[PDB]
Every structure is written in structure tokens, then in C-alpha cells.
Amino acid sequence: TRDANGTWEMESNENFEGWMKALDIDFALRKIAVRLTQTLVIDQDGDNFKVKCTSTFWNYDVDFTVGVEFDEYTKSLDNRHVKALVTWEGDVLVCVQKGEKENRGWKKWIEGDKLYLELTCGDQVCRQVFKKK
Ligand SMILES: *C/C=C(C)/C=C/C=C(C)/C=C/C1=C(C)CCCC1(C)C
């Protein structure tokens, strides 16, 4: 319920292109990223997280300690500097990324076998569902 450890296989991905567009990802690369199968690998140890979301051409990596603000440079995404902070709101893992973009961050709900991930930027929300492999 608070345990996010695992290798996570995607089963659905809603409004992916609206969220990428809100981040200003190149329209060309958007309709490549649309094609790619993603595997989310989470290593969680106490407060310390290592998140690795992987695909053929394109990976997103982040490591953080819950409750410790960190500078994040989204080099493989929109290549912006944000002030990221990840915390627990109940059993909901919440990341707020302060910077140019408003309403920017993500949330993870872990429901036994299922991981629900909502990514937000501006007025767009991308809803993803992964299953533990
Ligand atoms: C808790 C899980 C998180 C924060 C996972 C985030 C994953 C991404 C931001 C993935 C982004 C990607 C693209 C938009 C294009 C294709 C490659 C991806 C899947 C790494």
C-alpha cells in the first residue's frame, strides 16, 4: 500500500499526448513515444527511491529521498530545471515539481497488484496503470 518496489508492466495510458504536449515535447517525438512499450522499475529502500522508466529509444530516471527537496533537470524530457519534492499524503506518493510549469508533478497509488500513476502539467492529466510483473 506504501510499497512501490517492483518491475511494473504498463496496461493502460490515457491522455499521454496531451500531457507530453503540455510539457512542450516535440510533436515528432510524441508520436514515437506513443509507440513505445514502457517498463517502470522502482527500487524503494526506506525514504530512498530509485525510479527507472525504460523504453526502446528513451528512458526517464530519477532518484530522491522522501521529504528532501531536490533539483531535478528533466534532461530526457522537456529539459527544464524544477525543484522537486516527493512526500506521502496518506498512502499516496506525491511529487510536486516547482518551476515554470504550473500543476507539475505526479502521484502514485499502489493498490495491491496495480500501480496507478497520474502525471500532471498545466491543465493536463495523464493516467497510467501498471501491473507488477
Ligand atoms: C513514478 C513514476 C514516474 C515519475 C515515471 C515517469 C515516466 C515518464 C515521465 C516517462 C516518459 C517517457 C516519455 C514521455 C517518452 C517515451 C519514454 C518515456 C516513457 C520515458
Short mmCIF file of C-alpha atoms and ligand atoms in Angstrom, two decimals:
data_model
loop_
_atom_site.label_atom_id
_atom_site.label_comp_id
_atom_site.label_asym_id
_atom_site.label_seq_id
_atom_site.Cartn_x
_atom_site.Cartn_y
_atom_site.Cartn_z
CA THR A 1 0.00 0.00 0.00
CA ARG A 2 3.07 2.12 0.69
CA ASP A 3 5.33 -0.44 -1.03
CA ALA A 4 6.14 0.60 -4.58
CA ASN A 5 9.05 -1.84 -5.11
CA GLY A 6 8.81 -3.84 -8.29
CA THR A 7 9.12 -4.19 -12.02
CA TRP A 8 5.92 -2.70 -13.43
CA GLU A 9 4.33 -3.51 -16.78
CA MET A 10 2.02 -0.96 -18.36
CA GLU A 11 -1.57 -1.91 -19.15
CA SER A 12 -3.13 1.47 -19.97
CA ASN A 13 -2.10 5.02 -20.77
CA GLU A 14 -4.68 7.82 -21.12
CA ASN A 15 -4.12 11.38 -22.42
CA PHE A 16 -0.43 10.60 -22.89
CA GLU A 17 -0.14 13.02 -25.83
CA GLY A 18 -1.94 15.87 -24.09
CA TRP A 19 0.42 15.65 -21.15
CA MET A 20 3.52 15.46 -23.37
CA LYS A 21 2.22 18.42 -25.37
CA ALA A 22 1.70 20.42 -22.17
CA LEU A 23 5.40 19.79 -21.45
CA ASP A 24 6.31 21.06 -24.96
CA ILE A 25 7.73 17.75 -26.20
CA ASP A 26 8.35 17.87 -29.96
CA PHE A 27 5.29 16.70 -31.87
CA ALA A 28 7.56 14.38 -33.85
CA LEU A 29 8.94 12.59 -30.77
CA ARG A 30 5.46 12.46 -29.23
CA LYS A 31 4.27 10.12 -31.96
CA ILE A 32 7.33 7.99 -31.46
CA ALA A 33 6.85 7.89 -27.70
CA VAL A 34 3.23 6.93 -28.41
CA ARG A 35 4.52 3.66 -29.90
CA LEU A 36 6.94 2.58 -27.20
CA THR A 37 6.29 -0.09 -24.59
CA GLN A 38 7.32 1.17 -21.14
CA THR A 39 8.64 -0.74 -18.13
CA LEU A 40 8.69 1.02 -14.76
CA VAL A 41 11.26 -0.32 -12.26
CA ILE A 42 11.05 1.04 -8.69
CA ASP A 43 13.67 0.34 -6.02
CA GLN A 44 12.42 1.64 -2.68
CA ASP A 45 14.53 1.50 0.50
CA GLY A 46 13.17 3.44 3.46
CA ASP A 47 12.88 7.03 2.24
CA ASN A 48 15.26 6.39 -0.66
CA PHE A 49 13.78 5.77 -4.12
CA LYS A 50 15.29 4.91 -7.49
CA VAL A 51 12.78 5.10 -10.34
CA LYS A 52 13.64 3.91 -13.85
CA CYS A 53 11.08 4.07 -16.64
CA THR A 54 12.52 2.46 -19.75
CA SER A 55 11.71 2.10 -23.44
CA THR A 56 13.47 1.36 -26.73
CA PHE A 57 14.76 4.87 -27.51
CA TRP A 58 14.15 6.74 -24.34
CA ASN A 59 14.46 6.47 -20.54
CA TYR A 60 13.38 8.56 -17.54
CA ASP A 61 15.47 8.21 -14.38
CA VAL A 62 15.00 9.83 -11.00
CA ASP A 63 16.31 9.14 -7.50
CA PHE A 64 15.10 11.01 -4.43
CA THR A 65 14.67 10.84 -0.68
CA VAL A 66 11.11 11.33 0.52
CA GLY A 67 10.74 14.71 2.22
CA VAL A 68 14.01 16.16 0.83
CA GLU A 69 13.67 18.74 -1.94
CA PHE A 70 15.97 18.12 -4.87
CA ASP A 71 16.95 19.90 -8.04
CA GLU A 72 15.64 17.91 -10.98
CA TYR A 73 16.81 18.52 -14.53
CA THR A 74 14.42 16.69 -16.86
CA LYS A 75 17.20 16.23 -19.42
CA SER A 76 15.48 13.45 -21.37
CA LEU A 77 12.04 15.14 -21.19
CA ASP A 78 11.45 18.85 -21.69
CA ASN A 79 14.96 19.71 -20.37
CA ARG A 80 13.83 22.11 -17.62
CA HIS A 81 15.04 22.75 -14.09
CA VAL A 82 12.46 22.11 -11.36
CA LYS A 83 12.52 21.98 -7.57
CA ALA A 84 11.08 18.53 -6.93
CA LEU A 85 9.72 17.21 -3.64
CA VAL A 86 8.19 13.77 -3.01
CA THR A 87 6.05 13.10 0.05
CA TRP A 88 3.41 10.76 1.47
CA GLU A 89 -0.18 12.01 1.60
CA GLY A 90 -1.66 9.06 3.38
CA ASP A 91 -0.62 6.12 1.22
CA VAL A 92 -0.42 8.34 -1.89
CA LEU A 93 3.10 9.09 -3.14
CA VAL A 94 3.07 12.74 -4.26
CA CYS A 95 5.71 14.64 -6.22
CA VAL A 96 5.41 18.40 -6.75
CA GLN A 97 7.84 19.94 -9.24
CA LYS A 98 8.08 23.70 -8.74
CA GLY A 99 9.16 25.74 -11.74
CA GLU A 100 7.99 27.30 -14.97
CA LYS A 101 5.07 24.91 -15.45
CA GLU A 102 2.08 25.01 -13.13
CA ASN A 103 0.37 21.96 -11.59
CA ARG A 104 3.53 20.00 -12.42
CA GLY A 105 4.30 16.65 -10.83
CA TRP A 106 2.93 13.16 -10.40
CA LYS A 107 1.15 10.85 -7.97
CA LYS A 108 1.36 7.09 -7.40
CA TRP A 109 -1.46 4.99 -5.94
CA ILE A 110 -0.45 1.41 -5.18
CA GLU A 111 -3.41 -0.98 -4.99
CA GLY A 112 -2.01 -4.43 -4.26
CA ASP A 113 -1.16 -5.64 -7.76
CA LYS A 114 -1.92 -2.36 -9.57
CA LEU A 115 0.05 0.87 -9.76
CA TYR A 116 -1.91 3.97 -10.79
CA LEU A 117 0.27 6.87 -11.93
CA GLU A 118 -1.12 10.31 -12.77
CA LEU A 119 1.26 12.83 -14.34
CA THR A 120 0.20 16.46 -14.39
CA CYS A 121 1.37 19.60 -16.12
CA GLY A 122 -0.74 22.72 -16.62
CA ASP A 123 -4.35 21.63 -17.20
CA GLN A 124 -3.46 18.14 -18.46
CA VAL A 125 -3.51 14.86 -16.56
CA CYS A 126 -2.08 11.61 -17.93
CA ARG A 127 -3.43 8.47 -16.24
CA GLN A 128 -1.36 5.30 -16.37
CA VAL A 129 -1.95 1.82 -14.93
CA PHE A 130 0.86 -0.72 -14.43
CA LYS A 131 0.73 -4.29 -13.14
CA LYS A 132 3.54 -5.92 -11.18
CA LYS A 133 5.24 -8.44 -13.44
C1 LIG B 1 6.63 7.28 -10.53
C2 LIG B 1 6.90 7.15 -11.94
C3 LIG B 1 7.32 8.13 -12.77
C4 LIG B 1 7.55 9.54 -12.31
C5 LIG B 1 7.53 7.83 -14.18
C6 LIG B 1 7.66 8.71 -15.16
C7 LIG B 1 7.85 8.37 -16.55
C8 LIG B 1 7.99 9.22 -17.59
C9 LIG B 1 7.97 10.72 -17.41
C10 LIG B 1 8.17 8.70 -18.94
C11 LIG B 1 8.39 9.45 -20.04
C12 LIG B 1 8.58 8.99 -21.41
C13 LIG B 1 8.20 9.77 -22.45
C14 LIG B 1 7.22 10.88 -22.35
C15 LIG B 1 8.51 9.40 -23.88
C16 LIG B 1 8.91 7.95 -24.09
C17 LIG B 1 9.85 7.48 -22.99
C18 LIG B 1 9.27 7.65 -21.57
C19 LIG B 1 8.28 6.51 -21.32
C20 LIG B 1 10.43 7.51 -20.58
#
